[PDB]
Each structure stands twice: as structure tokens, then as C-alpha cells.
Amino acid sequence: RDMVVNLFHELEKMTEVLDHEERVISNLSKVLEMVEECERRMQPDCSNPLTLDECARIFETLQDKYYEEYRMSDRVDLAVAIVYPLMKEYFKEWDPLKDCTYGTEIISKWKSLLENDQLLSHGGQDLSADAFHRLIWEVWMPFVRNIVTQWQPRNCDPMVDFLDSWVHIIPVWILDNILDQLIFPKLQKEVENWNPLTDTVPIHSWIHPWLPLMQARLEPLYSPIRSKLSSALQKWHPSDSSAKLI
């Protein structure tokens, strides 16, 4: 009887593992069909191109039910092949200074779908093994580089609103590169062009929005500002309260 009892529970154990494996077989058959559907639709040969909203749905379905497939496979490489060409086209006409919010929700949606669970807090320079860090670096960063060269720091507001709306979304390592290497020399350069005695737009109106994002980093720039304002105060008289206001 104990032999029959042990085998019976073991037989039920085989059914609980036959039923489970069969479910994944039906699931992975869909997984293969979805990847083959994607590969077909991404070709110019297919008159039904894969829309970016549908590609998110595919990645959502693969992550939620089919999760084990992402953990074992090269989730980076799958994103590089599929997500990166489509994201390039979606941002191709994007002007971050005119519409700072375009693509914020989508990339945040993609952040949940592509950034590896260990790495969302770090945001480090993983161009080797993260699907999102190299996404923002290869797709999103080229458009930003061009615009910063064109951007005028006196009109900082579209650029401040852009960086603040994306600060929670983009990798931290990308942010530091933008602030130190691209934004900071231009902010200095704009101060070099700004003249306190002839410019009608007060410097605080366009430097102070950078106080949250940059904080301590703005300290070297205050000396040129103080020096030009020193030149402005040369003709100022204490009865003129406008210096106190500025």
C-alpha cells in the first residue's frame, strides 16, 4: 500500500508538472509567434508595420506572463534590434524645447519594460548589459546634443522643463554628462554675452531655474556674474532700489 501511496502522490506530482509544462509550451509557442510576427512586420516587405504602441504591448505581454524568457535571454539585444529603430523614428521629429512632454510617458513605460531591475536606481554607464541605458544614449541623446548647441540659456525655461520632466526617467549617468560638459560651458558663454546694463531680462529669471538640478555646480559661474554686476553697480547710486530687487 505504501508503494501504491507513494507512487499515487508521485503520479499527481507528474500531472502537476505535466499541466504546468504544457501551459508554458502553449505560452512559448505564442512567444515564438510574437517574435516571428515582429521580425516580419519590421521588414519593409510587410505592409503592416509594427506600431510603437503595439511593440510596447508585445513587451508588456512578454514581461508579465512569459517573464522567464527575458531573464534567460539577451533582453538588451532584443531591445537593440526591435525597440531602437522604432524609437529613432518616433523621436525623429521631436523638438524637446517645443514639446518637452512628448515621449516622456512612452520612455517611462519603456523604462519599466527595458531597464533591468537591479539598475533603475543606479542609472550607471552600462552600455554593455542594460537595454535602457544604451537606448537613451544611442536614440535619445543625439537629438539632445544638437539642440543644446542651438539652445540659448536666456530662454532657459524650455530646457529646464525638458530636463526636469526627464530627470526621473533618464539614466543618472547621462544627466551628469549633459550638465557638466554641455550645459555648463554654454551658461558661462551666455553670461559672457549678457550685459547687465543693457539687457532687459534679469539674470535670475534664467539662472535660478537651474538651482534644483545643478545646485553646487553653479558656484564657478557666480564669479563672472558678480564681476559683470560689479561693472553695472559702478554707475548705480544707493537711491536706486532696483539693484536690491535684482
Added chain:
Amino acid sequence: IDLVKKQLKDRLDSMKELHKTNRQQHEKHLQSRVDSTRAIERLEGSSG
């Protein structure tokens, strides 16, 4: 796309092979009980 697509093809057939193995073991374990079940009934009938 083919890098992930390769692994998905192989894994699906492998799970079927694992399913097939479990299916065959289910049949063999069923057979083992039958020969034991006969001995139970034979012992029970003789016990009365």
C-alpha cells in the same frame, strides 16, 4: 532578432521532450501500482 528567436525555438521543443519524459514516467508508475494493487487484493482476500 534572430539571437533571442534561436533560444525560443530550442527551448520550446526541449520543454516538449521534458513533458514527453514526464508523460512516459507517468505511464510506467501507473503500471507499477497495478501489479502492487493485485497483491493488495490477494492479501486482503486471504486475510479474511
